[PDB]
CSV table of C-alpha atoms in Angstrom, one decimal:
chain,number,residue,atom,x,y,z
A,1,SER,CA,77.8,119.1,-134.4
A,2,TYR,CA,79.7,121.3,-132.1
A,3,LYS,CA,79.9,125.3,-131.8
A,4,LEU,CA,82.9,127.1,-131.4
A,5,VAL,CA,82.4,130.4,-129.8
A,6,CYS,CA,84.8,133.0,-129.5
A,7,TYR,CA,84.8,136.3,-127.6
A,8,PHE,CA,86.9,139.0,-128.5
A,9,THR,CA,87.2,142.4,-126.9
A,10,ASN,CA,87.3,146.1,-127.8
A,11,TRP,CA,90.3,146.9,-125.7
A,12,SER,CA,92.9,144.8,-127.2
A,13,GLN,CA,93.1,147.3,-129.8
A,14,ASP,CA,94.8,150.1,-127.2
A,15,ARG,CA,97.4,147.7,-126.7
A,16,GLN,CA,100.8,147.7,-128.1
A,17,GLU,CA,102.2,146.0,-130.9
A,18,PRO,CA,102.3,143.1,-131.4
A,19,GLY,CA,99.6,142.4,-128.8
A,20,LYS,CA,97.5,145.0,-130.9
A,21,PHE,CA,93.9,143.4,-132.1
A,22,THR,CA,91.1,144.4,-134.3
A,23,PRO,CA,88.1,142.9,-135.6
A,24,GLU,CA,90.4,142.8,-139.0
A,25,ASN,CA,92.5,140.3,-137.1
A,26,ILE,CA,89.7,137.7,-137.3
A,27,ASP,CA,89.7,134.5,-139.2
A,28,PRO,CA,86.3,134.1,-140.3
A,29,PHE,CA,86.3,130.3,-140.4
A,30,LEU,CA,88.0,130.0,-137.2
A,31,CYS,CA,85.0,130.1,-134.9
A,32,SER,CA,81.5,129.3,-135.4
A,33,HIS,CA,80.4,132.2,-133.4
A,34,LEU,CA,82.1,135.4,-132.5
A,35,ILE,CA,81.1,137.8,-129.6
A,36,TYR,CA,82.1,141.2,-129.2
A,37,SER,CA,82.8,142.2,-125.7
A,38,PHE,CA,81.1,144.9,-124.6
A,39,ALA,CA,78.8,147.1,-125.5
A,40,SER,CA,77.0,149.4,-122.6
A,41,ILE,CA,73.7,151.1,-121.8
A,42,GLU,CA,72.7,155.0,-122.1
A,43,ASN,CA,69.7,156.3,-121.4
A,44,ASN,CA,68.1,152.5,-121.3
A,45,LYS,CA,69.3,152.0,-124.7
A,46,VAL,CA,72.1,149.8,-125.9
A,47,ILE,CA,75.3,151.6,-127.3
A,48,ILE,CA,79.0,150.7,-128.1
A,49,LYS,CA,81.6,152.8,-126.8
A,50,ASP,CA,84.6,152.1,-129.0
A,51,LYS,CA,86.5,154.7,-131.1
A,52,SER,CA,86.4,152.0,-133.8
A,53,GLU,CA,82.7,151.3,-133.8
A,54,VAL,CA,82.3,152.1,-137.4
A,55,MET,CA,85.1,150.1,-138.6
A,56,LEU,CA,83.8,147.1,-136.4
A,57,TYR,CA,80.7,147.2,-138.6
A,58,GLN,CA,82.6,147.0,-141.6
A,59,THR,CA,84.2,144.1,-140.6
A,60,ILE,CA,81.4,142.4,-139.1
A,61,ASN,CA,79.7,142.5,-142.8
A,62,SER,CA,83.0,141.6,-144.5
A,63,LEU,CA,83.4,138.7,-142.4
A,64,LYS,CA,79.7,137.5,-142.6
A,65,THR,CA,80.0,137.9,-146.6
A,66,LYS,CA,83.1,135.7,-146.3
A,67,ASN,CA,81.2,133.0,-144.2
A,68,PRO,CA,77.6,132.8,-144.4
A,69,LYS,CA,77.5,130.3,-141.7
A,70,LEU,CA,79.1,132.8,-139.2
A,71,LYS,CA,77.4,133.9,-136.2
A,72,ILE,CA,78.4,137.2,-134.3
A,73,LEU,CA,76.8,138.0,-131.2
A,74,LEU,CA,77.2,141.2,-129.2
A,75,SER,CA,77.9,141.1,-125.7
A,76,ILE,CA,76.7,143.3,-122.9
A,77,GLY,CA,78.2,143.4,-119.4
A,78,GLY,CA,81.4,142.0,-118.5
A,79,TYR,CA,83.2,142.5,-115.3
A,80,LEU,CA,83.8,146.4,-115.4
A,81,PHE,CA,80.1,146.6,-116.0
A,82,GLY,CA,79.0,144.8,-113.2
A,83,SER,CA,75.5,145.2,-111.9
A,84,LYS,CA,75.5,148.9,-111.6
A,85,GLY,CA,75.6,149.4,-115.1
A,86,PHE,CA,72.3,147.7,-115.6
A,87,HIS,CA,70.4,150.2,-113.4
A,88,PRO,CA,68.4,151.6,-113.7
A,89,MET,CA,67.4,149.9,-116.8
A,90,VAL,CA,66.2,146.9,-115.1
A,91,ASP,CA,63.9,148.6,-112.7
A,92,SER,CA,60.8,148.9,-114.7
A,93,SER,CA,58.7,147.0,-117.6
A,94,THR,CA,58.9,150.4,-118.8
A,95,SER,CA,62.3,150.9,-118.8
A,96,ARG,CA,63.4,147.3,-119.7
A,97,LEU,CA,60.9,147.3,-122.6
A,98,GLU,CA,62.9,150.5,-124.1
A,99,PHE,CA,66.0,148.6,-123.7
A,100,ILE,CA,64.8,145.7,-125.2
A,101,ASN,CA,63.4,147.3,-128.2
A,102,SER,CA,66.9,149.2,-129.0
A,103,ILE,CA,68.4,145.6,-128.7
A,104,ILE,CA,66.3,144.0,-131.6
A,105,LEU,CA,66.7,147.5,-133.6
A,106,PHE,CA,70.6,147.6,-132.9
A,107,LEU,CA,71.2,144.3,-133.8
A,108,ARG,CA,69.3,144.3,-137.0
A,109,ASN,CA,70.6,147.4,-138.1
A,110,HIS,CA,74.2,146.0,-137.6
A,111,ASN,CA,74.0,142.7,-138.8
A,112,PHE,CA,74.2,140.9,-135.5
A,113,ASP,CA,72.9,137.6,-135.0
A,114,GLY,CA,72.1,137.4,-131.4
A,115,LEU,CA,72.8,138.9,-128.0
A,116,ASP,CA,74.9,137.8,-125.0
A,117,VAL,CA,74.3,138.8,-121.7
A,118,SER,CA,77.1,138.8,-119.5
A,119,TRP,CA,75.8,140.0,-116.4
A,120,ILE,CA,78.7,139.6,-114.0
A,121,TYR,CA,77.3,138.6,-111.7
A,122,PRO,CA,73.7,139.0,-110.6
A,123,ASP,CA,74.2,137.3,-107.3
A,124,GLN,CA,71.6,137.3,-104.7
A,125,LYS,CA,70.5,141.0,-105.0
A,126,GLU,CA,69.7,140.8,-108.8
A,127,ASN,CA,68.8,137.3,-109.6
A,128,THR,CA,65.5,138.4,-110.0
A,129,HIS,CA,66.2,141.4,-112.6
A,130,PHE,CA,68.6,139.1,-114.5
A,131,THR,CA,65.8,136.5,-114.5
A,132,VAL,CA,63.1,138.7,-115.7
A,133,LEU,CA,65.5,140.6,-118.4
A,134,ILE,CA,66.7,137.2,-119.8
A,135,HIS,CA,62.8,136.2,-119.9
A,136,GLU,CA,61.6,139.4,-121.5
A,137,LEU,CA,64.3,139.3,-123.8
A,138,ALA,CA,63.6,135.8,-125.1
A,139,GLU,CA,59.8,136.5,-125.3
A,140,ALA,CA,60.7,139.6,-127.4
A,141,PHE,CA,63.0,137.8,-129.7
A,142,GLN,CA,60.3,135.4,-130.5
A,143,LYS,CA,57.6,137.9,-131.2
A,144,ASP,CA,60.1,139.4,-133.3
A,145,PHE,CA,60.6,136.2,-135.1
A,146,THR,CA,57.0,135.7,-135.8
A,147,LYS,CA,56.9,138.6,-137.7
A,148,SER,CA,59.9,138.8,-139.6
A,149,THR,CA,61.7,136.7,-142.8
A,150,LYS,CA,65.2,136.8,-140.9
A,151,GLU,CA,66.5,134.4,-138.7
A,152,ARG,CA,65.8,134.4,-134.8
A,153,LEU,CA,67.7,136.3,-132.8
A,154,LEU,CA,70.0,134.4,-130.5
A,155,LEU,CA,70.0,135.1,-126.8
A,156,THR,CA,72.9,133.5,-124.9
A,157,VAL,CA,74.5,134.5,-121.3
A,158,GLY,CA,78.2,134.4,-120.1
A,159,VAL,CA,77.5,132.6,-116.6
A,160,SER,CA,79.3,131.9,-113.4
A,161,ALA,CA,81.0,128.4,-113.0
A,162,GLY,CA,81.1,128.8,-109.0
A,163,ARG,CA,78.6,126.7,-107.1
A,164,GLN,CA,77.8,129.4,-104.5
A,165,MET,CA,77.3,132.1,-107.3
A,166,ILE,CA,75.3,129.7,-109.5
A,167,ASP,CA,72.9,129.0,-106.7
A,168,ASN,CA,72.7,132.6,-105.6
A,169,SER,CA,72.3,134.0,-109.1
A,170,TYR,CA,70.2,131.9,-111.6
A,171,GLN,CA,66.7,130.3,-111.9
A,172,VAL,CA,68.5,127.7,-114.1
A,173,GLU,CA,65.1,125.7,-114.8
A,174,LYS,CA,63.7,128.7,-116.7
A,175,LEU,CA,67.3,129.9,-118.0
A,176,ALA,CA,67.2,126.8,-119.7
A,177,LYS,CA,64.1,127.8,-121.7
A,178,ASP,CA,65.0,131.4,-122.5
A,179,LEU,CA,68.4,130.7,-123.5
A,180,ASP,CA,69.8,129.4,-126.9
A,181,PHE,CA,72.8,128.3,-124.7
A,182,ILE,CA,75.1,129.4,-122.1
A,183,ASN,CA,78.6,130.6,-122.2
A,184,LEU,CA,80.2,129.0,-119.1
A,185,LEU,CA,82.8,131.1,-117.8
A,186,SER,CA,84.8,128.0,-116.4
A,187,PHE,CA,88.2,129.5,-115.9
A,188,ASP,CA,89.3,132.2,-113.4
A,189,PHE,CA,89.3,129.8,-110.6
A,190,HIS,CA,92.4,130.6,-109.1
A,191,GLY,CA,94.3,133.8,-109.4
A,192,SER,CA,96.4,136.3,-107.2
A,193,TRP,CA,93.3,137.5,-105.4
A,194,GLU,CA,92.8,134.3,-103.2
A,195,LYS,CA,93.6,134.4,-99.5
A,196,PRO,CA,95.8,132.8,-98.3
A,197,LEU,CA,97.9,133.3,-101.1
A,198,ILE,CA,99.1,130.1,-102.6
A,199,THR,CA,99.6,129.0,-106.4
A,200,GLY,CA,96.7,127.4,-108.0
A,201,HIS,CA,95.6,127.0,-111.6
A,202,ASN,CA,93.5,129.2,-113.5
A,203,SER,CA,91.3,126.6,-115.2
A,204,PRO,CA,91.9,123.0,-114.0
A,205,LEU,CA,89.9,120.3,-115.8
A,206,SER,CA,89.2,118.2,-112.6
A,207,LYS,CA,89.9,118.5,-108.9
A,208,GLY,CA,93.1,118.1,-107.1
A,209,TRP,CA,93.7,115.2,-104.9
A,210,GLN,CA,93.7,117.4,-101.9
A,211,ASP,CA,90.8,119.7,-103.0
A,212,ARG,CA,88.7,118.5,-100.1
A,213,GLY,CA,85.3,119.9,-98.9
A,214,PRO,CA,84.4,123.2,-100.9
A,215,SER,CA,87.6,123.5,-102.9
A,216,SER,CA,86.4,120.4,-105.0
A,217,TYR,CA,84.0,122.6,-106.6
A,218,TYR,CA,86.4,124.7,-108.7
A,219,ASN,CA,87.3,122.7,-111.6
A,220,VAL,CA,85.8,122.6,-115.1
A,221,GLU,CA,84.3,119.1,-114.5
A,222,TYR,CA,82.6,120.1,-111.8
A,223,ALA,CA,81.2,123.3,-113.0
A,224,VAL,CA,79.6,121.7,-116.0
A,225,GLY,CA,78.1,118.7,-114.1
A,226,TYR,CA,76.6,121.1,-111.6
A,227,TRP,CA,74.8,123.3,-114.4
A,228,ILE,CA,73.4,119.9,-115.6
A,229,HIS,CA,72.5,118.6,-112.3
A,230,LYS,CA,70.7,122.1,-111.9
A,231,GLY,CA,68.3,121.8,-114.9
A,232,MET,CA,70.4,122.8,-117.9
A,233,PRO,CA,70.7,120.0,-120.7
A,234,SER,CA,74.2,119.3,-122.1
A,235,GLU,CA,73.9,120.4,-125.5
A,236,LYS,CA,73.2,124.1,-124.0
A,237,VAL,CA,76.4,124.1,-122.0
A,238,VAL,CA,79.2,125.7,-124.3
A,239,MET,CA,82.1,125.3,-122.3
A,240,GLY,CA,84.7,128.0,-121.3
A,241,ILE,CA,88.4,127.6,-122.2
A,242,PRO,CA,90.8,130.2,-121.5
A,243,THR,CA,93.8,131.5,-123.8
A,244,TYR,CA,95.4,133.2,-120.8
A,245,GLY,CA,97.2,132.0,-117.6
A,246,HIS,CA,97.5,133.5,-114.1
A,247,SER,CA,101.0,134.2,-112.5
A,248,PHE,CA,102.4,134.1,-109.2
A,249,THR,CA,105.5,135.3,-107.7
A,250,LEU,CA,106.9,132.4,-105.5
A,251,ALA,CA,107.5,133.3,-101.9
A,252,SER,CA,109.8,130.1,-101.0
A,253,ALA,CA,111.4,127.8,-103.4
A,254,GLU,CA,108.6,125.1,-103.2
A,255,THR,CA,107.4,125.1,-106.9
A,256,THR,CA,104.3,122.8,-106.3
A,257,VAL,CA,100.4,123.7,-106.3
A,258,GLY,CA,99.8,125.1,-103.2
A,259,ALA,CA,103.4,126.6,-102.7
A,260,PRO,CA,103.3,130.2,-100.9
A,261,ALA,CA,103.5,133.4,-103.3
A,262,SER,CA,104.5,136.9,-102.8
A,263,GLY,CA,102.2,137.9,-104.8
A,264,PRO,CA,100.9,138.2,-108.6
A,265,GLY,CA,103.8,137.3,-110.9
A,266,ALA,CA,105.3,140.1,-113.0
A,267,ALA,CA,103.3,141.7,-115.7
A,268,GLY,CA,103.7,140.7,-118.9
A,269,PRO,CA,105.7,142.8,-121.6
A,270,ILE,CA,102.1,143.6,-123.7
A,271,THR,CA,99.4,143.0,-121.4
A,272,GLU,CA,100.9,144.9,-118.6
A,273,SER,CA,98.9,143.4,-115.9
A,274,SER,CA,100.0,141.9,-112.8
A,275,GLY,CA,99.3,138.2,-112.6
A,276,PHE,CA,98.2,137.6,-115.8
A,277,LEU,CA,99.7,136.4,-119.1
A,278,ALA,CA,98.4,136.0,-122.5
A,279,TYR,CA,99.5,132.9,-124.6
A,280,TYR,CA,101.5,134.8,-127.0
A,281,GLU,CA,103.4,135.8,-123.7
A,282,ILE,CA,103.3,132.5,-122.2
A,283,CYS,CA,105.2,131.0,-125.2
A,284,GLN,CA,108.0,133.5,-124.6
A,285,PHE,CA,107.9,132.6,-120.9
A,286,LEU,CA,108.1,129.0,-121.3
A,287,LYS,CA,111.4,129.5,-123.1
A,288,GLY,CA,113.7,128.0,-120.4
A,289,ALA,CA,111.1,126.9,-117.9
A,290,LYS,CA,110.0,123.9,-116.5
A,291,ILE,CA,106.6,122.7,-117.5
A,292,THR,CA,104.5,120.2,-115.4
A,293,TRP,CA,101.3,118.4,-116.3
A,294,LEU,CA,98.9,117.9,-113.3
A,295,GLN,CA,98.1,114.4,-113.5
A,296,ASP,CA,95.0,114.8,-111.4
A,297,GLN,CA,93.7,118.1,-112.6
A,298,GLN,CA,94.8,117.8,-116.2
A,299,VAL,CA,96.5,120.8,-117.1
A,300,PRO,CA,100.2,122.1,-117.2
A,301,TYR,CA,102.2,125.0,-115.2
A,302,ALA,CA,105.4,126.3,-115.7
A,303,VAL,CA,108.2,127.4,-113.5
A,304,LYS,CA,111.1,129.9,-114.0
A,305,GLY,CA,112.8,131.8,-111.7
A,306,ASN,CA,110.4,132.5,-109.0
A,307,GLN,CA,107.5,132.7,-111.4
A,308,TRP,CA,104.9,130.1,-111.5
A,309,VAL,CA,102.3,129.9,-114.3
A,310,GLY,CA,99.2,128.0,-114.6
A,311,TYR,CA,97.9,128.2,-118.2
A,312,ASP,CA,96.0,126.0,-120.8
A,313,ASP,CA,98.2,124.5,-124.0
A,314,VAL,CA,97.3,122.3,-126.7
A,315,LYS,CA,97.2,119.2,-125.0
A,316,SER,CA,94.9,120.8,-122.6
A,317,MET,CA,92.6,121.9,-125.5
A,318,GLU,CA,92.2,118.5,-126.7
A,319,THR,CA,91.8,117.0,-123.2
A,320,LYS,CA,89.1,119.5,-122.2
A,321,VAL,CA,87.5,119.0,-125.8
A,322,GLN,CA,87.5,115.0,-125.4
A,323,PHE,CA,85.7,116.0,-122.0
A,324,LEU,CA,83.1,117.8,-123.7
A,325,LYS,CA,82.5,115.4,-126.3
A,326,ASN,CA,82.2,112.7,-123.6
A,327,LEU,CA,79.4,114.5,-121.8
A,328,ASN,CA,77.4,115.8,-124.9
A,329,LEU,CA,77.8,119.3,-124.2
A,330,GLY,CA,77.2,122.2,-127.0
A,331,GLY,CA,80.8,122.9,-127.8
A,332,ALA,CA,83.5,125.3,-126.6
A,333,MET,CA,83.7,128.9,-125.9
A,334,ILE,CA,86.9,130.8,-125.9
A,335,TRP,CA,87.9,133.8,-123.8
A,336,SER,CA,89.1,135.3,-125.5
A,337,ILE,CA,90.8,134.7,-129.0
A,338,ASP,CA,93.0,138.3,-128.8
A,339,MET,CA,95.1,136.2,-126.2
A,340,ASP,CA,95.9,133.2,-128.4
A,341,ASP,CA,98.7,133.8,-130.6
A,342,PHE,CA,96.7,135.3,-133.5
A,343,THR,CA,99.7,136.8,-135.4
A,344,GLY,CA,101.2,133.4,-135.1
A,345,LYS,CA,104.6,134.9,-134.8
A,346,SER,CA,105.1,134.6,-131.0
A,347,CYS,CA,104.6,130.8,-130.6
A,348,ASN,CA,105.5,130.2,-134.2
A,349,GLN,CA,102.7,127.5,-134.7
A,350,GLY,CA,100.6,129.4,-137.0
A,351,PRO,CA,98.1,132.0,-136.3
A,352,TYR,CA,95.7,131.0,-133.2
A,353,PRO,CA,97.5,127.7,-132.2
A,354,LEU,CA,95.5,127.2,-129.5
A,355,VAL,CA,91.9,127.8,-131.1
A,356,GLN,CA,93.0,125.9,-134.1
A,357,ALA,CA,93.7,123.0,-131.9
A,358,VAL,CA,90.2,123.2,-130.2
A,359,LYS,CA,88.7,123.7,-133.8
A,360,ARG,CA,90.5,120.7,-135.2
A,361,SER,CA,89.8,118.4,-131.9
A,362,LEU,CA,86.0,119.3,-132.1
A,363,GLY,CA,85.8,118.5,-135.6
A,364,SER,CA,87.9,115.4,-135.5
A,365,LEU,CA,85.4,112.3,-135.9
């Protein structure tokens, strides 16, 4: 009775082997929902910018023929898109209606089952537009439903897991009615962008003992409880779990949480991004490393030389799965499946070792 929502991206295909990922890589029975990241907007109309656009549709149909229970959504937004991307679409009921009408037509034309709106992040300034957009979206979906013999288009949204940003950005109460569920972006708590610069975990389940005051807020456990305390039912929280880790270059020889860092760890050989590692990169790094399991935070990290990696692993997946069953949440969301060991030949534990673990752990009675 849980959902497994998997994001996949349109830029992993530009990566080099064997990090190259296309929709053809997808196991139609892995996740319950799939989300394509990301669409965009031009002339107040939805549009996809991907040289492999038409091959996407091919796979989408092929995938859905094979799994009639599979849902596939189109996500719009994302970090790079920001708020800007949404202008000036959001500035008019006339502009927004043109937009929404194009969504409905698009998704239906291309066999999508719903729309995810990952506005990163509305914050104070766009709280209002977001809220209207969503609301107008849900309404319109409903109307389209009444007059149709098709299932009802789904509407979801990727949302922040930081308290401040949550308070600033969302009318949760309303959000709860308009959204079929949320994808809680409960990761990227700590990275190499922090000041001061010390090691912290990308996605801790619970707070470190020393996390006092405002830091005590940045763990998965806190984020979920707050979206619940703020008015979102549990069953509507799909909890975010990451398939990547964050990398630090150690300043001293102190290998513990809180130790000082020079900067982000060395970019990986495939991902080529400083302070970021795909799990298929992490499996190699772990070779000849020292792994420690934070008893308090419930998640591991690894040290090799002067490189510090806070990541999630199988024990991490199952531990977080248990937590989510315990709080009667909707399920798990994965960001993103192209960073898991999908070919299965890096970590040698079969394709999608992490997501299979989430999938297995969810299904286990």
